[PDB]
Amino acid sequence: SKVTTVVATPGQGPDRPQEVSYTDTKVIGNGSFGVVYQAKLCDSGELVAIKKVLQDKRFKNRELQIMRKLDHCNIVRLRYFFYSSGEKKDEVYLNLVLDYVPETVYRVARHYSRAKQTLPVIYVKLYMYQLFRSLAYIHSFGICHRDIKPQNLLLDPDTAVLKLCDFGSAKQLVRGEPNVSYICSRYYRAPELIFGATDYTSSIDVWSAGCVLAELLLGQPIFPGDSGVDQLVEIIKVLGTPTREQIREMNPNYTEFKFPQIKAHPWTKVFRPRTPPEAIALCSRLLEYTPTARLTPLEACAHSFFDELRDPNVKLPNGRDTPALFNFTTQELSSNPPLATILIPPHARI
Ligand SMILES: COCCN1CCC(CNC(=O)c2n[nH]c3ccc(-c4cccc(F)c4F)cc23)CC1
Known part of the structure; x- marks a missing residue:
């Protein structure tokens, strides 16, 4: 197979370009x-x-x-x-x-779903926690990803490490500077965006993350809308109709859909009988109409649903140790530094 050689610049550190060779190129998305x-790097493999x-x-x-x-x-x-x-x-x-990274959350979830099986709750905890960590970090710079969905959650099945990818929709959000409302993948799109809000915050990613959590518990997308407008209908079928206060909190540009009143479907009846209560509770605090009522990514990481991950005797189902879940830098704690006592348990403290 033919080798390609380029003079490439390192992503981190000062601009010091180096020769990089690679081979075995194949198209994997567009x-x-x-x-x-x-591709495969020639030197390291x-x-x-x-x-x-x-x-x-x-x-x-x-x-x-x-x-x-x-x-x-x-x-x-x-x-x-x-x-x-x-x-x-x-x-x-x-x-x-x-x-x-060899797998995605999408592909893994679909493996379980085709076999008529639920993803074990340990993996749900592991994958969601690491997502909320990735969000805590990017949000501390004012960066909003704006495309949180299972296909952009890469994973290594052997180590259970989750990596967030595809920053093609991502943006530094600045208060008072407008942003496009038709953004995010439809099933994961926050309700404020469907109402045409152009002054929205990083909490749109928390909505998207909530949709991912619900998907992993259900075995299928929670809000499968067949268009941009029907997406709101699907949300209404679980959450109920939003109140005028909730509509006002979403900062809409248009509210002329003319939707009939529908009562909220209780969160316990949405999911399976044996779904853990803490998973349901966490999901209720992510999938909130009022964007400011949603948990921050760091508060989400501190929820009781992730307590098993903080237990010192936790292991992966393959026998190995869990990945590094507790090495929090000051940058990633900056939204709420008192949460470190909950987030870093006794055995993980330095
Ligand atoms: C049926 O055969 C399918 C072949 N499939 C198997 C799974 C494998 C998983 N790996 C990745 O998708 C991946 N790993 N690192 C990445 C870094 C960036 C991106 C990326 C995502 C969305 C938009 C973009 F513009 C991107 F660059 C994806 C990945 C892929 C190939």
Whole structure:
């Protein structure tokens, strides 16, 4: 197989470009951005993902600037970036070299669902906790991901490490500067966005995360809307109709859907009989109409649903130890530093 050699720039640290060689390139996704590849690095043998995107030569890439400032165990690492030219004049591609992770939450959840099985609650705890950690970290910079869904939750089945990926929709949210409302993948889209809100906060990711939790407990998407508007109908069938106060808290640009009143479906009746109460409780505090009433990612990590993960005798079902769940930096605690007593249990303290 033919080797490609590029002069690529490290994602972290100062601009010191290095020769990087790779081989065994194969197409593994596409989208409006362009195309994504798998590849193997010649020197180490380690697998990588390569996001190739058509980038204008004048303007700076938003996703690149976000990826260069992030360093976290639950976020896919930008190893390198490089530029490659096109056939046409002034046609430049940005290439982001990211670490390869062999599975996703989507694929794993679908394995259980096709076999008529529930994902064990230990994995639900592990995967959701690490998601809320990834969100606590990005939100502390004012970065909102805006595309939290199972396909963007990468995982290693042997270690149970979860890595958040695809920062193509992500943005530094600035109070008083508008943002687009038609954002996020439909099933995971917060209700304020469906009402056309352009002044929204990082709590949209917490809604999205709540939808992921519910999906893993149910074995299927909780709000499977067949269009942008029917998405609200599906939410209403569980949560009930939002009150005018709740509609006002969502900061809408239009409220002329003309929906009939529907009563809330009790949270216990949504899920299976044997669903743990703490899972239901956590889900009730994530899937809230009022965006400010939702738990922060750090408060979510501290919920009683994740207590099993803080128990010193916890192991994975394959025999191995759990990943590093407690090495919290000051940056990731900055929203609420008194939560460290709950988040870092006695045996994990330093
Ligand atoms: C039927 O065969 C399917 C082959 N499938 C098996 C699972 C495997 C899982 N791995 C990844 O998807 C992955 N690993 N690291 C990544 C870094 C970035 C991205 C990424 C995601 C969305 C949009 C983008 F623009 C992206 F670059 C995905 C990944 C993939 C290949």
